[PDB]
Coordinates of C-alpha atoms in Angstrom, one line a residue:
Chain H
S9 CA -83.2 -162.7 92.7
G10 CA -86.5 -160.7 90.8
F11 CA -86.5 -157.4 90.3
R12 CA -90.4 -156.0 92.2
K13 CA -92.0 -152.5 92.3
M14 CA -90.8 -152.0 95.6
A15 CA -91.8 -149.4 98.3
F16 CA -89.7 -147.6 101.5
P17 CA -91.1 -148.9 104.5
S18 CA -93.5 -146.5 105.5
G19 CA -93.7 -146.7 109.3
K20 CA -91.6 -143.5 109.9
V21 CA -93.8 -141.7 107.8
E22 CA -97.2 -143.2 108.9
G23 CA -96.3 -141.3 112.4
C24 CA -96.5 -137.9 111.0
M25 CA -99.9 -138.0 109.3
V26 CA -103.0 -136.2 111.0
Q27 CA -106.7 -135.1 109.9
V28 CA -107.0 -131.3 109.0
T29 CA -110.6 -130.0 108.7
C30 CA -110.9 -127.0 107.7
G31 CA -115.3 -126.0 107.3
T32 CA -116.7 -129.0 105.9
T33 CA -113.4 -130.4 104.1
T34 CA -111.3 -132.8 105.4
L35 CA -107.8 -133.9 104.4
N36 CA -104.6 -135.4 105.4
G37 CA -102.1 -133.5 107.3
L38 CA -98.2 -133.6 108.0
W39 CA -97.4 -133.5 111.3
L40 CA -93.8 -132.6 112.3
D41 CA -92.1 -130.8 114.9
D42 CA -95.1 -128.6 116.3
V43 CA -96.3 -127.6 112.7
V44 CA -98.9 -129.1 110.3
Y45 CA -98.2 -129.1 106.4
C46 CA -101.8 -129.3 104.6
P47 CA -102.6 -128.3 101.1
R48 CA -104.0 -125.1 101.2
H49 CA -107.6 -125.7 99.5
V50 CA -108.6 -127.1 102.4
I51 CA -110.2 -123.8 103.2
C52 CA -111.7 -123.9 99.5
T53 CA -115.4 -124.8 99.6
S54 CA -116.5 -126.9 96.4
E55 CA -118.0 -123.6 95.1
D56 CA -114.6 -121.5 95.7
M57 CA -112.3 -124.3 94.2
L58 CA -113.4 -123.0 90.6
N59 CA -111.5 -119.5 91.3
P60 CA -110.3 -119.0 94.5
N61 CA -109.1 -116.5 96.0
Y62 CA -106.6 -118.0 98.6
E63 CA -105.7 -114.4 100.6
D64 CA -109.4 -113.8 100.8
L65 CA -110.6 -117.2 101.7
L66 CA -108.1 -117.6 104.5
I67 CA -108.5 -114.1 106.3
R68 CA -111.9 -115.1 106.7
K69 CA -110.3 -117.9 108.8
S70 CA -108.5 -118.1 112.3
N71 CA -106.6 -120.6 114.2
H72 CA -110.1 -121.9 116.0
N73 CA -111.3 -122.7 112.6
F74 CA -108.6 -125.7 111.8
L75 CA -109.3 -128.9 113.9
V76 CA -106.1 -130.8 113.1
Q77 CA -106.4 -134.7 115.2
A78 CA -103.9 -137.2 115.3
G79 CA -105.9 -140.7 115.5
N80 CA -108.5 -139.6 118.1
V81 CA -106.2 -137.2 119.8
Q82 CA -106.9 -133.2 119.3
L83 CA -104.0 -130.5 118.7
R84 CA -104.5 -126.8 119.3
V85 CA -103.4 -124.6 116.8
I86 CA -101.8 -121.2 117.8
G87 CA -101.1 -120.1 114.5
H88 CA -101.1 -120.3 110.9
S89 CA -99.8 -119.4 107.6
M90 CA -99.9 -119.8 104.0
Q91 CA -96.3 -120.7 102.4
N92 CA -97.0 -120.7 98.6
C93 CA -99.9 -123.8 97.9
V94 CA -99.0 -125.2 102.1
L95 CA -100.9 -124.0 104.9
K96 CA -98.6 -124.5 107.9
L97 CA -100.6 -124.5 111.3
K98 CA -98.4 -124.1 114.3
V99 CA -100.1 -126.6 117.2
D100 CA -99.0 -126.8 120.7
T101 CA -97.6 -130.3 121.0
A102 CA -94.4 -131.1 118.7
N103 CA -95.5 -134.6 117.6
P104 CA -93.0 -137.6 119.6
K105 CA -92.7 -139.8 116.7
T106 CA -90.9 -137.0 114.4
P107 CA -88.3 -139.0 112.7
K108 CA -85.0 -137.4 111.3
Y109 CA -86.9 -135.9 107.9
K110 CA -85.4 -133.2 105.1
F111 CA -87.4 -131.1 102.6
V112 CA -86.0 -131.7 98.8
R113 CA -87.7 -131.0 95.7
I114 CA -86.8 -134.1 93.7
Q115 CA -86.0 -133.7 89.3
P116 CA -88.1 -134.9 87.2
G117 CA -87.5 -138.9 86.6
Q118 CA -86.7 -139.6 90.3
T119 CA -88.6 -142.0 92.4
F120 CA -90.4 -141.6 95.7
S121 CA -93.0 -143.8 98.1
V122 CA -96.0 -141.9 98.0
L123 CA -98.4 -143.2 101.4
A124 CA -102.0 -143.1 100.1
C125 CA -104.5 -141.7 103.3
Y126 CA -107.5 -141.3 103.9
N127 CA -109.1 -138.8 106.9
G128 CA -105.8 -138.9 108.3
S129 CA -104.9 -142.5 108.0
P130 CA -102.6 -144.4 106.2
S131 CA -104.4 -146.6 103.8
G132 CA -101.8 -147.9 101.1
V133 CA -98.1 -147.6 99.9
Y134 CA -96.3 -147.4 96.6
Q135 CA -93.9 -146.4 94.3
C136 CA -94.4 -143.6 91.9
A137 CA -91.8 -141.5 89.6
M138 CA -92.2 -137.9 88.9
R139 CA -92.6 -138.0 85.2
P140 CA -90.6 -135.6 83.1
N141 CA -94.3 -133.5 82.5
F142 CA -94.0 -133.0 85.9
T143 CA -97.4 -134.9 87.2
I144 CA -97.7 -138.8 88.4
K145 CA -99.1 -141.5 87.2
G146 CA -101.0 -142.1 91.4
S147 CA -103.6 -143.7 92.8
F148 CA -105.6 -141.5 94.7
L149 CA -109.4 -140.7 95.5
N150 CA -111.4 -137.9 97.0
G151 CA -109.9 -137.0 100.4
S152 CA -106.4 -138.1 99.5
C153 CA -104.9 -134.6 99.2
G154 CA -102.5 -134.2 101.4
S155 CA -100.6 -137.6 101.0
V156 CA -97.2 -137.1 101.0
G157 CA -94.4 -139.0 98.9
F158 CA -90.9 -139.5 100.3
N159 CA -87.7 -141.1 100.2
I160 CA -85.8 -142.7 103.3
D161 CA -82.0 -142.9 103.5
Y162 CA -81.6 -144.9 106.6
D163 CA -82.4 -142.8 109.1
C164 CA -83.8 -139.4 107.3
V165 CA -87.0 -139.1 105.9
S166 CA -87.0 -136.8 102.7
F167 CA -90.2 -135.7 101.8
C168 CA -90.5 -134.4 98.4
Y169 CA -94.4 -134.7 97.0
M170 CA -98.0 -133.4 98.7
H171 CA -100.5 -134.4 96.8
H172 CA -102.9 -131.3 95.7
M173 CA -105.0 -132.2 92.7
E174 CA -106.1 -135.2 89.9
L175 CA -106.4 -133.0 86.6
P176 CA -109.6 -134.3 84.1
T177 CA -106.8 -136.4 82.5
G178 CA -106.9 -138.6 85.4
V179 CA -103.2 -137.8 86.1
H180 CA -101.9 -136.2 89.6
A181 CA -100.4 -133.1 90.4
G182 CA -99.5 -131.5 93.6
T183 CA -96.3 -129.7 95.5
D184 CA -92.9 -129.9 96.9
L185 CA -93.3 -129.5 101.3
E186 CA -92.8 -126.1 100.7
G187 CA -96.1 -125.7 98.8
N188 CA -94.8 -125.3 95.6
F189 CA -96.1 -127.1 92.6
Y190 CA -94.3 -129.5 90.3
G191 CA -95.0 -128.0 86.9
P192 CA -97.1 -125.6 85.5
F193 CA -100.3 -126.4 87.5
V194 CA -102.3 -124.1 90.0
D195 CA -104.6 -125.4 93.0
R196 CA -108.0 -124.5 91.3
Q197 CA -110.9 -126.6 89.5
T198 CA -109.9 -125.3 85.5
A199 CA -108.7 -126.7 82.3
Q200 CA -105.5 -128.0 83.2
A201 CA -103.2 -129.8 81.0
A202 CA -100.0 -131.6 81.1
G203 CA -97.8 -131.3 78.1
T204 CA -96.1 -134.2 76.5
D205 CA -94.8 -137.1 78.7
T206 CA -92.0 -138.4 77.3
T207 CA -90.4 -141.4 78.7
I208 CA -86.9 -141.6 81.1
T209 CA -84.4 -143.0 79.0
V210 CA -82.3 -143.7 81.7
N211 CA -84.5 -145.4 83.8
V212 CA -85.3 -148.1 80.8
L213 CA -81.9 -148.4 80.6
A214 CA -81.6 -149.5 84.7
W215 CA -84.4 -151.6 84.2
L216 CA -83.0 -152.9 81.1
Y217 CA -79.7 -154.3 83.3
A218 CA -81.6 -154.8 86.1
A219 CA -83.2 -157.6 83.5
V220 CA -79.9 -158.5 82.2
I221 CA -78.5 -159.1 86.3
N222 CA -81.4 -161.4 86.6
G223 CA -81.0 -163.6 83.8
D224 CA -83.3 -161.9 81.2
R225 CA -80.8 -161.4 78.5
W226 CA -83.0 -162.1 75.2
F227 CA -83.1 -158.8 74.0
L228 CA -79.2 -158.4 74.0
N229 CA -78.4 -157.5 70.3
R230 CA -74.6 -158.1 68.2
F231 CA -75.4 -154.0 68.0
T232 CA -73.6 -150.8 69.2
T233 CA -74.8 -147.3 68.2
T234 CA -73.6 -143.6 68.9
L235 CA -75.1 -141.2 71.5
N236 CA -76.3 -139.1 68.8
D237 CA -77.6 -141.9 66.9
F238 CA -79.3 -143.0 69.8
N239 CA -80.5 -139.7 70.5
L240 CA -81.8 -139.8 66.7
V241 CA -84.2 -142.6 67.2
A242 CA -85.5 -141.9 71.1
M243 CA -86.7 -138.4 69.6
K244 CA -89.2 -140.2 67.3
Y245 CA -90.2 -142.2 70.0
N246 CA -90.6 -139.3 72.4
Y247 CA -87.4 -140.6 75.0
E248 CA -85.9 -137.8 77.0
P249 CA -82.5 -137.2 75.2
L250 CA -79.4 -139.4 76.7
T251 CA -76.7 -137.3 78.0
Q252 CA -73.0 -138.0 79.3
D253 CA -74.6 -137.8 82.8
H254 CA -76.9 -140.1 82.3
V255 CA -74.0 -142.9 80.7
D256 CA -71.9 -141.6 83.8
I257 CA -74.5 -142.8 86.3
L258 CA -75.0 -145.8 84.6
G259 CA -71.3 -146.7 84.7
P260 CA -71.6 -149.2 87.8
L261 CA -74.9 -151.5 86.6
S262 CA -72.5 -151.6 83.4
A263 CA -69.7 -152.5 85.4
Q264 CA -71.3 -155.1 86.9
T265 CA -72.9 -156.3 83.8
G266 CA -70.1 -155.9 81.5
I267 CA -71.9 -154.6 79.0
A268 CA -71.1 -151.3 78.1
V269 CA -73.6 -148.7 78.4
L270 CA -73.8 -147.8 74.1
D271 CA -74.7 -151.3 73.4
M272 CA -77.4 -151.5 75.5
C273 CA -78.6 -148.2 73.8
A274 CA -78.3 -150.3 70.9
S275 CA -80.5 -153.0 71.9
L276 CA -83.4 -150.5 73.3
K277 CA -83.0 -148.9 69.7
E278 CA -83.8 -151.9 68.3
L279 CA -86.5 -153.3 71.0
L280 CA -88.2 -149.0 69.8
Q281 CA -88.0 -149.7 66.5
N282 CA -89.2 -153.1 66.4
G283 CA -91.3 -154.2 69.8
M284 CA -91.3 -156.8 71.8
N285 CA -92.9 -159.7 69.7
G286 CA -95.0 -160.8 72.4
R287 CA -92.4 -160.9 74.6
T288 CA -92.1 -160.1 78.0
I289 CA -89.0 -158.1 79.6
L290 CA -89.2 -159.0 83.9
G291 CA -92.7 -159.8 83.7
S292 CA -93.4 -156.8 81.3
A293 CA -94.8 -156.2 77.9
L294 CA -93.6 -152.6 78.1
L295 CA -90.8 -151.1 78.6
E296 CA -90.4 -150.0 82.3
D297 CA -89.1 -146.3 82.8
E298 CA -90.2 -145.7 86.9
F299 CA -86.8 -147.6 88.4
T300 CA -84.1 -145.3 88.7
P301 CA -80.1 -146.2 88.6
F302 CA -80.3 -145.9 92.6
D303 CA -83.3 -148.3 92.6
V304 CA -81.8 -150.9 90.6
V305 CA -78.7 -151.1 92.5
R306 CA -80.3 -151.2 95.6
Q307 CA -83.0 -153.4 94.9
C308 CA -80.5 -156.0 93.2
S309 CA -78.1 -155.9 96.0
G310 CA -80.6 -155.2 99.0
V311 CA -79.5 -151.9 101.1
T312 CA -81.6 -151.5 104.0
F313 CA -83.2 -148.9 106.6
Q314 CA -84.2 -147.9 110.2
Chain T
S27 CA -109.0 -142.1 90.2
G28 CA -106.0 -144.2 89.0
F29 CA -105.3 -148.1 89.5
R30 CA -101.5 -149.1 91.2
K31 CA -100.2 -152.1 92.6
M32 CA -100.1 -151.1 96.5
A33 CA -99.1 -152.8 99.6
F34 CA -100.2 -152.2 103.1
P35 CA -98.9 -149.2 105.4
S36 CA -95.8 -151.6 106.9
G37 CA -94.9 -150.2 110.2
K38 CA -96.9 -152.5 112.8
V39 CA -94.9 -155.0 110.5
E40 CA -91.6 -153.0 110.9
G41 CA -91.9 -152.9 114.6
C42 CA -91.6 -156.6 114.9
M43 CA -88.5 -157.6 112.7
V44 CA -85.6 -159.0 114.6
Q45 CA -82.3 -160.4 113.4
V46 CA -81.8 -164.2 114.5
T47 CA -77.9 -165.3 114.0
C48 CA -77.4 -169.3 114.9
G49 CA -73.7 -170.0 114.1
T50 CA -72.6 -168.0 111.0
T51 CA -76.1 -167.8 109.6
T52 CA -78.1 -164.8 110.0
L53 CA -81.5 -163.9 109.1
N54 CA -85.4 -162.3 110.0
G55 CA -87.0 -163.7 112.5
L56 CA -90.5 -162.4 113.3
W57 CA -90.6 -160.8 117.4
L58 CA -94.6 -161.5 118.4
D59 CA -95.4 -161.5 122.3
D60 CA -92.3 -163.2 123.9
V61 CA -91.7 -165.9 120.5
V62 CA -89.5 -165.2 117.9
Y63 CA -90.5 -167.1 114.8
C64 CA -87.8 -167.9 111.9
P65 CA -86.9 -170.1 109.3
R66 CA -85.3 -173.3 110.9
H67 CA -82.7 -173.4 108.5
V68 CA -81.3 -170.5 110.7
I69 CA -79.7 -174.0 112.3
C70 CA -78.1 -175.2 108.8
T71 CA -74.3 -174.6 107.3
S72 CA -74.7 -173.9 103.7
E73 CA -72.9 -177.8 103.9
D74 CA -76.0 -178.7 105.6
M75 CA -78.3 -177.2 103.6
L76 CA -78.1 -180.0 100.7
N77 CA -79.2 -182.7 102.9
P78 CA -80.6 -181.5 106.7
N79 CA -81.7 -183.7 109.2
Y80 CA -83.1 -180.7 111.7
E81 CA -83.7 -183.1 114.3
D82 CA -79.9 -183.6 115.1
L83 CA -78.7 -180.9 113.7
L84 CA -81.1 -178.9 116.5
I85 CA -80.4 -181.3 119.0
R86 CA -76.6 -180.0 118.4
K87 CA -78.2 -176.2 119.7
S88 CA -78.7 -174.7 123.2
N89 CA -80.7 -171.7 123.8
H90 CA -77.5 -169.5 124.1
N91 CA -76.4 -170.2 120.2
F92 CA -79.3 -168.4 118.9
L93 CA -78.9 -164.5 119.3
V94 CA -81.5 -162.5 118.7
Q95 CA -80.7 -158.7 118.1
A96 CA -84.0 -156.2 118.4
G97 CA -82.3 -152.9 116.4
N98 CA -79.2 -153.0 118.5
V99 CA -80.7 -154.8 122.0
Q100 CA -80.2 -158.4 122.5
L101 CA -82.9 -160.8 123.6
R102 CA -82.7 -163.4 126.1
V103 CA -83.4 -166.7 124.1
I104 CA -85.2 -169.5 127.0
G105 CA -86.5 -172.0 124.9
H106 CA -86.8 -172.9 122.0
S107 CA -88.5 -175.6 119.7
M108 CA -89.2 -176.7 116.1
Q109 CA -92.8 -177.0 115.0
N110 CA -92.7 -177.9 110.9
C111 CA -90.5 -175.9 109.3
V112 CA -90.2 -172.9 111.7
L113 CA -88.3 -172.3 114.8
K114 CA -89.8 -170.5 117.5
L115 CA -87.5 -169.5 120.7
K116 CA -89.3 -168.1 123.6
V117 CA -87.4 -164.6 125.0
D118 CA -87.7 -163.2 128.2
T119 CA -89.4 -159.8 127.2
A120 CA -92.2 -159.2 125.1
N121 CA -92.6 -156.9 121.9
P122 CA -93.6 -153.8 123.1
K123 CA -94.4 -153.0 119.8
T124 CA -97.0 -156.0 119.6
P125 CA -99.7 -155.5 117.1
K126 CA -103.2 -157.2 117.7
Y127 CA -102.2 -160.0 115.0
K128 CA -103.9 -163.3 113.6
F129 CA -101.8 -166.1 112.1
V130 CA -103.8 -167.6 108.6
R131 CA -103.0 -170.3 105.7
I132 CA -104.0 -168.2 102.5
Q133 CA -105.6 -169.6 99.5
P134 CA -104.4 -169.7 96.2
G135 CA -104.9 -166.6 94.2
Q136 CA -105.1 -164.7 97.5
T137 CA -102.8 -161.7 98.0
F138 CA -100.3 -159.7 100.3
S139 CA -97.9 -157.4 101.0
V140 CA -94.4 -158.6 101.7
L141 CA -91.8 -156.7 103.9
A142 CA -88.7 -157.6 102.5
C143 CA -85.7 -157.4 105.1
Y144 CA -82.1 -157.6 105.3
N145 CA -80.1 -158.2 108.7
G146 CA -83.4 -157.9 111.1
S147 CA -84.0 -154.3 109.2
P148 CA -86.8 -153.4 106.7
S149 CA -86.0 -152.4 103.4
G150 CA -88.9 -152.6 101.2
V151 CA -92.4 -153.6 101.0
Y152 CA -94.3 -154.8 97.6
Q153 CA -97.5 -156.7 97.2
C154 CA -97.3 -160.2 95.9
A155 CA -100.1 -163.1 95.3
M156 CA -100.2 -166.7 96.0
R157 CA -99.4 -168.7 92.4
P158 CA -102.1 -171.4 91.9
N159 CA -98.7 -173.4 92.0
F160 CA -98.4 -172.2 95.8
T161 CA -94.9 -170.0 94.4
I162 CA -94.9 -166.2 94.5
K163 CA -92.6 -164.2 91.9
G164 CA -90.8 -161.5 94.3
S165 CA -87.2 -159.7 95.0
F166 CA -85.7 -161.8 97.4
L167 CA -81.8 -162.0 98.2
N168 CA -79.7 -163.7 100.3
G169 CA -80.3 -162.7 104.1
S170 CA -84.1 -161.5 102.9
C171 CA -85.4 -165.3 104.7
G172 CA -87.4 -164.7 107.2
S173 CA -88.9 -161.5 105.5
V174 CA -93.0 -162.1 106.3
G175 CA -96.1 -161.5 104.2
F176 CA -98.7 -160.1 105.9
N177 CA -102.6 -158.6 105.3
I178 CA -104.1 -155.4 107.3
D179 CA -107.6 -155.3 108.8
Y180 CA -107.9 -151.7 110.1
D181 CA -106.1 -152.9 113.3
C182 CA -105.4 -156.2 112.9
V183 CA -101.9 -157.8 111.2
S184 CA -103.2 -161.4 109.4
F185 CA -99.4 -162.6 109.0
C186 CA -99.9 -165.2 106.1
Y187 CA -95.7 -166.1 104.7
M188 CA -92.5 -166.5 105.9
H189 CA -89.9 -166.8 102.9
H190 CA -87.7 -169.5 103.1
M191 CA -86.2 -170.8 99.7
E192 CA -85.5 -169.2 96.0
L193 CA -86.3 -172.5 93.7
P194 CA -83.4 -172.8 90.9
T195 CA -86.2 -171.3 88.9
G196 CA -85.9 -168.0 90.2
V197 CA -89.4 -168.2 92.1
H198 CA -89.6 -168.2 95.8
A199 CA -91.3 -170.5 98.5
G200 CA -91.8 -170.4 102.0
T201 CA -94.4 -171.4 104.7
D202 CA -97.4 -170.0 107.1
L203 CA -96.4 -169.2 110.1
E204 CA -97.1 -172.5 111.9
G205 CA -94.1 -173.4 109.9
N206 CA -96.0 -175.6 106.8
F207 CA -94.8 -174.6 103.3
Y208 CA -97.0 -173.4 100.7
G209 CA -96.7 -176.0 98.3
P210 CA -94.9 -179.1 97.5
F211 CA -91.7 -177.2 98.6
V212 CA -89.2 -178.7 101.4
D213 CA -86.4 -176.6 102.9
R214 CA -83.3 -178.5 101.4
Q215 CA -81.3 -177.2 98.1
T216 CA -82.3 -179.6 96.3
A217 CA -83.2 -179.6 92.3
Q218 CA -87.5 -179.1 93.4
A219 CA -89.7 -178.0 90.4
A220 CA -93.4 -175.8 90.8
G221 CA -95.6 -177.2 88.6
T222 CA -97.9 -175.2 85.6
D223 CA -98.4 -171.7 87.2
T224 CA -101.7 -171.0 85.3
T225 CA -103.3 -167.6 86.0
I226 CA -106.0 -165.9 88.5
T227 CA -109.1 -165.9 86.0
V228 CA -111.1 -164.2 88.9
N229 CA -108.6 -161.7 89.6
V230 CA -108.1 -160.8 85.9
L231 CA -111.8 -160.1 85.7
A232 CA -111.5 -158.2 88.8
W233 CA -108.6 -156.2 87.3
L234 CA -111.2 -155.9 84.0
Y235 CA -114.2 -154.1 86.4
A236 CA -111.2 -152.1 87.6
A237 CA -110.1 -150.7 84.1
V238 CA -113.4 -149.9 83.1
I239 CA -113.6 -148.1 86.5
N240 CA -111.3 -145.8 85.3
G241 CA -112.1 -145.1 81.9
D242 CA -110.4 -148.0 80.0
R243 CA -113.6 -149.5 78.2
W244 CA -111.9 -150.4 74.5
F245 CA -112.2 -153.9 75.5
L246 CA -115.9 -154.2 76.2
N247 CA -117.2 -155.9 73.3
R248 CA -120.6 -156.8 72.1
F249 CA -120.3 -160.4 72.7
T250 CA -121.8 -163.0 75.7
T251 CA -120.2 -166.5 76.7
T252 CA -121.3 -169.2 79.1
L253 CA -119.5 -170.5 81.7
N254 CA -118.6 -173.9 80.0
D255 CA -117.5 -172.1 77.4
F256 CA -115.7 -169.5 79.0
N257 CA -113.7 -172.4 81.0
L258 CA -113.0 -174.0 77.3
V259 CA -111.0 -171.0 76.1
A260 CA -109.5 -170.8 79.7
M261 CA -108.2 -174.7 79.9
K262 CA -106.8 -173.9 76.5
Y263 CA -104.8 -170.8 77.5
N264 CA -103.8 -172.2 81.2
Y265 CA -106.3 -170.0 82.9
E266 CA -108.0 -171.4 86.0
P267 CA -111.6 -172.7 85.9
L268 CA -114.0 -169.9 86.8
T269 CA -116.5 -171.2 89.7
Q270 CA -120.1 -169.9 90.5
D271 CA -118.3 -169.0 93.5
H272 CA -116.2 -166.3 91.6
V273 CA -119.1 -165.0 90.0
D274 CA -120.9 -164.2 93.4
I275 CA -117.5 -162.7 94.5
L276 CA -117.5 -160.3 91.3
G277 CA -120.7 -159.2 91.8
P278 CA -120.4 -156.0 93.9
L279 CA -118.0 -154.9 90.7
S280 CA -120.9 -156.3 88.1
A281 CA -122.9 -154.3 90.0
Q282 CA -121.0 -151.3 90.3
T283 CA -120.5 -150.8 86.6
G284 CA -123.6 -152.4 85.1
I285 CA -121.4 -155.0 83.5
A286 CA -122.6 -158.6 84.1
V287 CA -119.8 -160.8 84.7
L288 CA -120.6 -163.1 81.7
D289 CA -120.3 -160.7 79.9
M290 CA -117.1 -159.7 81.0
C291 CA -116.2 -163.5 80.5
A292 CA -116.5 -162.8 77.0
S293 CA -114.5 -159.7 76.4
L294 CA -111.4 -161.4 78.4
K295 CA -112.1 -164.4 76.1
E296 CA -111.6 -162.3 73.0
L297 CA -108.6 -160.9 74.7
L298 CA -106.9 -163.9 75.0
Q299 CA -107.7 -165.3 71.2
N300 CA -106.4 -162.3 69.8
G301 CA -104.2 -160.4 71.7
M302 CA -104.5 -156.7 72.7
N303 CA -102.8 -155.1 69.3
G304 CA -99.9 -153.5 70.9
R305 CA -103.2 -150.9 73.3
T306 CA -102.3 -151.0 76.4
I307 CA -105.2 -151.8 79.7
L308 CA -104.5 -149.7 83.0
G309 CA -101.0 -149.0 81.5
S310 CA -99.9 -152.9 80.9
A311 CA -99.5 -154.8 77.8
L312 CA -100.8 -158.1 79.6
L313 CA -103.8 -159.0 81.7
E314 CA -102.9 -159.0 85.2
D315 CA -103.8 -161.2 87.6
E316 CA -102.4 -160.0 91.0
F317 CA -105.4 -158.3 92.2
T318 CA -108.5 -159.9 93.8
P319 CA -112.0 -158.6 93.9
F320 CA -111.5 -157.5 97.3
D321 CA -108.4 -155.8 96.3
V322 CA -110.2 -153.9 93.8
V323 CA -113.0 -152.5 95.7
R324 CA -110.6 -151.4 98.3
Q325 CA -108.5 -149.5 96.0
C326 CA -111.5 -148.3 93.9
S327 CA -113.2 -146.8 97.0
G328 CA -110.3 -146.4 99.4
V329 CA -110.9 -147.7 103.0
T330 CA -108.3 -147.2 105.4
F331 CA -106.3 -148.9 108.6
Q332 CA -105.2 -148.2 111.4

């Protein structure tokens, strides 16, 4: 028993982290097959980041301007290209530690594990959710750019995130591994704001199911509700609207716990309207929304990976 | 910027997880050099766990009764011994993935990363603290026994925990890698209770320092206090007494933030006496005590590992 915010095992991703240096800027790169992926702003100076013309800046750069280092070995770069906001450097040797992998663009509300790295060296691993406003609340210091977020499916690493910027808000933005930013953000040091950050309702419901599974049943009320009345309540509290797709996704936990989804919705509505009165649920005094139903099922019956 | 409960990279530990089966019971083992370490209750039946004589039970067992499997390869066991509550099985091949490692017995209040495994396969990684009552609040399902907790110091894995039991409380107990339990717990299915679980005061102080570093300064008050008056307040709220050793340990963060330790103690005392009034600190509506000052320094200036 027990419920914890849990990240995937990170060894297969550790095997792919390298250090990319261009000019005086050093960040992290992802070395898969004979290609190293990294943020393109590796070619920027500190002054260039205020208003960068990435095409003109990249044109001043040649293959030998990019120093790629795996541990303490040096990779020879034989070509470079810019795919959206990512730089792809073709190297002479394919990574012998390349895992079976895929590039995926996750949906808002989905979760992934971030391997925070510095100078190409992994430093930590933690779980994150792509917020509805397409930011993430991470732990990223200077030099962490190029760190990646991923999911593991037994043997296959699905990379979904590469970290590019910290907004003046303190939250973080990044791209998929094809270089397309999540959200309306751009890789320049300018005033950028993420919109209203709503709460992932289906995730909170899955978390309440996990709580019930682990013995925390105090919030279970005598009420039920309708989907439309629940959404009425959800819009007042900045909760994303609940759909029948969400109900179907929650199906399995409802069958395991014997609690209909709309009864859980009524309990959540009472929680939103009257607070928690100084109590805790699964050791938290807030409603947690960074656990998908998939996460809950996986951690409540314990699936493993390669 | 940002602050997250963050675990160590787990690849070096993943390389050492094997599956140990005795009779009908299968759990996880730690394969270092030519020795596999596992909980001794691997030799117990479900009925034996109610009152086990481990010496008599182990005497009915021979080397060939222990099946050790690394991935899908089988290890030949050439000897077995019982060190306190751990079984040590000598195998014929030394683990080629053995990292530089140490066995350490951590102190209450210290933290470590747990690699939750099932059938010798790593499934997740999360950060835990050894509670003052020598339990941990983890996520452990059936088959998770033998999962290990560790710390990483650049190249060296310090193993400190092996998971043996879930108490009827729902919290978890285990041993060091020499087989000595943390706390007064024994490996039999009987009524076992952990004492009062106090809050690690120095950890909460480090967490408040981390919050100040990350821009959350609302709790900084106009008061200061004495160590003895602060402990007066701490004993009422089940906080472990603060010592001058704790003040010295907090020294560096006090120098970084410009906030004396006793002023932070006064702020924490006001928080304890008047609650949080529906506010949050670092995204939490409770006082967090699972971050050591070492964790805070590491995550606020970003040290890396091999």
